[PDB]
Symmetry: C6
Amino acid sequence: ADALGMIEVRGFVGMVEAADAMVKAAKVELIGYEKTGGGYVTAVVRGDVAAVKAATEAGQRAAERVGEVVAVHVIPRPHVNVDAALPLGRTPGMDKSA
Amino acid sequence: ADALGMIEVRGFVGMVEAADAMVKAAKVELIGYEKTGGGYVTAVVRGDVAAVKAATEAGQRAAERVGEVVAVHVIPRPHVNVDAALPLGRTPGMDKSA
Amino acid sequence: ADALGMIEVRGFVGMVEAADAMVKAAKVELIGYEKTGGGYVTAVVRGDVAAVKAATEAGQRAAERVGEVVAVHVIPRPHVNVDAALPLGRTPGMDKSA
Amino acid sequence: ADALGMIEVRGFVGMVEAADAMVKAAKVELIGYEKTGGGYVTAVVRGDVAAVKAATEAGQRAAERVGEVVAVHVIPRPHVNVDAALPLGRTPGMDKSA
Amino acid sequence: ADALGMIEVRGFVGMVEAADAMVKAAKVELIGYEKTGGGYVTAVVRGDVAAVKAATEAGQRAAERVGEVVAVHVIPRPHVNVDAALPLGRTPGMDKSA
Amino acid sequence: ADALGMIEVRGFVGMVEAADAMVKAAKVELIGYEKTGGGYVTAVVRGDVAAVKAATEAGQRAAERVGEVVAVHVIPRPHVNVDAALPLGRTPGMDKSA
């Protein structure tokens, strides 16, 4: 599975800026955003480990100027159970080559 | 794609005043508002880069008199993945010109 | 469009008292209330500029005795885009004379 | 219209005790409860003005022993627009006598 | 009606530990849990007064070690209006012997 | 019934890292995650008592590096009423062996 990048912000605007910067910096796909209430939202991007690493670093830098960044993290090889149980945009089995 | 303008406020009233001020200040379309819970809401406008910039600065000014503004930001050239994955009122492909 | 009055309270009871006082003080219609989570709720009334001004002032005075008022604001002539994009009870086109 | 009694608590348990105490203290009907997020909930009772006043004071007393009461308020003669626009268990027109 | 026991925790894990300890300590039924947002959740158990009293005391002791307990309370004889209007797992009339 | 493991975090990213670490550390199934609002989320894993214990300690370790962990707890032998009333991924009766 592709690597996993996540930028959590207590602020929609900052999360949007994180997402925009990430997809512009590297070959990663913004698959969606998670809403957990209380003003907390998370931008999720996926791609190769190198791409997700470069995107996440750029997303953090730019979002920090506009909003309240809660967390920034990269998971190079997410477990298949994680992708199946959590909404991260790469449901196992969703593949034409499968 | 149109430029993107956003005023985030922990308060519906302040966001409404922001939104009202933006569409009055320049030729921009208020496409809707995002609810992220915890009292956090974001007014979203779209238009040309010059127009959205003029709108947001007036919106920040107006919202600040009524509420606690959380974030104010403009993205002149938002990435297509962002408009596709996030609800910003400019879904790629939604155009009569095709 | 009719003028717009809004009383935001972090407390349902105080918001209800705001709403009750507003419709009693002047010729304005309580069109509903907006729920943005985190305990935040907003009472929305509409009517002529003078009526909404008198209502909002009475709503603020009484609500302040019972709850936590977040914001109080009046918009005399809300933009048509605001009424169309936001739930303020006067959707443009919803008129028998139209 | 019946008088309106309300006990708002940042805590479900405290609200439940408030509601229980109100309907036990006087001839009032617990019509339901409002959820505004952030842990905020409001118990709503309806009945004659004397009954709701007796209920709320007992409810405040009982809720205070269990939780953090946010607001306590009585509206003897609520405006018809309020009962029509807000969920208080006495929708105008809902009556067999017509 | 059976007695009513409630353990409110600002934390799902602590609420789960409360619920588990309660049903293990005495003859009470965990009927469900109430979600009021802001991280607030409440475990609700019902049974005879003695059983609910023993359960609630054990639920409080164990939950306090794991999470943030907001409120703990027992209602021996909840009013019929409470069980009808609030989701506490004993809707009046839901009985085969009725 | 399988043992129950839980990592609660006020942050989606920290919870995702917890969940990822748990299923990687031991033979446990991430059954899902609970959303209680206010930014609070809980990762839920099921498996043998030894496995879930190994998972949670690794999950706490991993989540703590990324976010603010709210609660960490293991229930070796959860009561059947808990699995029936709460969404923990092991509904009693859901078994081919019957």
